Each structure stands twice: as structure tokens, then as C-alpha cells.
Design a protein around this ligand. Structure first.
Ligand SMILES: N[C@@H](Cc1c[nH]c2ccccc12)C(=O)O
Ligand SMILES: [Zn+2]
Length: 256
């Protein structure tokens, strides 16, 4: 099926998912000199104090940290958003080398990785209905650069050896996603899509300006994960990022 290689990677996705060539695809390059400050944006509210993580899953393309989204516990509101969006999962995209890995770019600059906190609009009742709506999802994107370790990431790094291969999961309760956030919530926002098949055009993207730093040893552990299943030959899970797609006359707004 779809993947990140020569034969099944982003250049091929349009065949099973024609929307890959659509009008609001993600990621995009953020041209900081074209983005305009928007005084009408309300402040962003990231409310993760009551977040309830359940499980971490290697899905053969990345790893998902899943949350209990059956009540308002971990929510995003404000900024460009109307109403309340509940956190369902987070995951990362990363490179084989520190010079690449993010999906969004900033004036063409690629970061070592990018974190996506995925949230659905509680007016649509659940995730599956939300992804049929142009305002169904809100993704909080955070860049990772290699430098100092991120302490709040280490519980994730240390569980990775237990989910090396496709289909493996592990209990992952009491993980606090507040430990993954940079200091500043300054952000760019634009309308876009999920960045993996089925590439649904349902996302208000909120991309924070300030990257988090993670250590070389932390990202190296991401690169030890496998795309393949247990029992299959080793295919390191690296370079699971889609490159920048055409902006097509969308406007990126700045909160700052
Ligand atoms: N089952 C998916 C998400 C999903 C697919 N269809 C849905 C319908 C309703 C709610 C959620 C879903 C998951 O969490 O892996
Ligand atoms: Zn993603």
C-alpha cells in the first residue's frame, strides 16, 4: 500500500488518492514575508491539564500516541478556531538526517522533525464525521530541532523499543503532552489537509513558530523504529514526511 519509498511514496499517492493534487493540500512552505499578521485572531488556548493518554501504536508509517477523547479533557480553542477541538492522538514525522524531516518548511528551511497534535471539532460528534467537514480538524504542528534534550519527550523515546515494528502497541497512560510544547504559542495558520493518505482536506493548521529542541540521542531512537512487521526484513522508519505542496492562493496568517 502507500508509503514513503521510491515506488509507493508521496509522488504516487495521487493514483489511489486523487485529492493529493487538490486545492488545499498540506504541508506547505511558510513564506514568512508573505504571511500577514491577523489582528482578528483571538489568543490560542491549549488546555491539556486533564489529558488522558491510553496507548502508543506503531502503524507502519509513524507512531501514534492515542488519547481518550470521550469527554473534554485535552482541548484546543481560540486562535483561528470556532468552538472546541478535542485531542485524539499525536505523532511525528522525521528524517534519516538532522537536515530534513519536517513537513512544513519555513522560508524553505526543513527541521529535523515535526510533531502533529491532531484534534477534532466536537460539533461533529466524532473523528469519523469530523473528517467529512472542511472545519473538522485542527492540527497543532511543532517543529523539532536537534540540540538540548526535551525531558518531556523521554517517556516516548523509552517506550519505542517495545513497538519497534508495524502493528505493535504498548500501554501508554499518564503521558502529559504539555511537556512537548515550546514557551511561545506564536503561530502561523492556514486551511489544509491531513498529510497522509487519505489526505482529507479538513484541517485548520496551526503551526507554532518556536521549535522545541530534542537531543541527537532522542531523534536517533526514532530512527531505530521499523516500517516493516516483526518477522519481515528491516526497513528503518525514517523520512516519513510529505514534502511541501502548492499553496494555490490560500493565505497564511500570522498570530504575531
Ligand atoms: N478508528 C480510527 C479513527 C476512526 C475511523 N473511523 C471513525 C469513525 C468514528 C470515529 C473515529 C473513527 C482510529 O482511532 O484509529
Ligand atoms: Zn502528521
Amino acid at each position: 500500500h502507500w508509503g514513503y519509498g521510491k515506488h509507493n511514496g508521496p509522488e504516487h499517492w495521487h493514483k489511489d488518492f486523487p485529492i493529493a493534487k487538490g486545492e488545499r493540500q498540506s504541508p506547505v512552505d511558510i513564506d514568512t514575508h508573505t504571511a500577514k499578521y491577523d489582528p482578528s485572531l483571538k489568543p490560542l488556548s491549549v488546555s491539556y491539564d486533564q489529558a488522558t493518554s491510553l496507548r502508543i501504536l506503531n502503524n507502519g508509517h509513524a507512531f501514534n500516541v492515542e488519547f481518550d477523547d470521550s469527554q473534554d479533557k485535552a482541548v484546543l480553542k481560540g486562535g483561528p478556531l470556532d468552538g472546541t477541538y478535542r485531542l485524539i492522538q499525536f505523532h511525528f514525522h522525521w528524517g534519516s538526517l538532522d537536515g530534513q524531516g519536517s513537513e512544513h518548511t519555513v522560508d524553505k528551511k526543513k527541521y529535523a522533525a515535526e510533531l502533529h497534535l491532531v484534534h477534532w471539532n466536537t460539533k461533529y460528534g466524532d473523528f469519523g464525521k469530523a473528517v467529512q467537514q472542511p472545519d473538522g480538524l485542527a492540527v497543532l504542528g511543532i517543529f523539532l530541532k536537534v540540540g538540548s534534550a526535551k525531558p518531556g519527550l523521554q517517556k516516548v523515546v523509552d517506550v519505542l523499543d517495545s513497538i519497534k515494528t508495524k502493528g505493535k502497541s504498548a500501554d501508554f497512560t499518564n503521558f502529559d503532552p504539555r511537556g512537548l510544547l515550546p514557551e511561545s504559542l506564536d503561530y502561523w495558520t492556514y486551511p489544509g489537509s491531513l498529510t497522509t493518505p487519505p489526505l482529507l482536506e479538513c484541517v485548520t493548521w496551526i503551526v507554532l513558530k518556536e521549535p522545541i529542541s530534542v537531543s541527537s540521542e532522542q531523534v536517533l531512537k526514532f530512527r531505530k523504529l521499523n516500517f516493516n512487521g516483526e518477522g519481515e526484513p528491516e526497513e528503518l522508519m525514517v523520512d516519513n514526511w510529505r514534502p511541501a505542496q502548492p499553496l494555490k492562493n490560500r493565505q497564511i496568517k500570522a498570530s504575531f
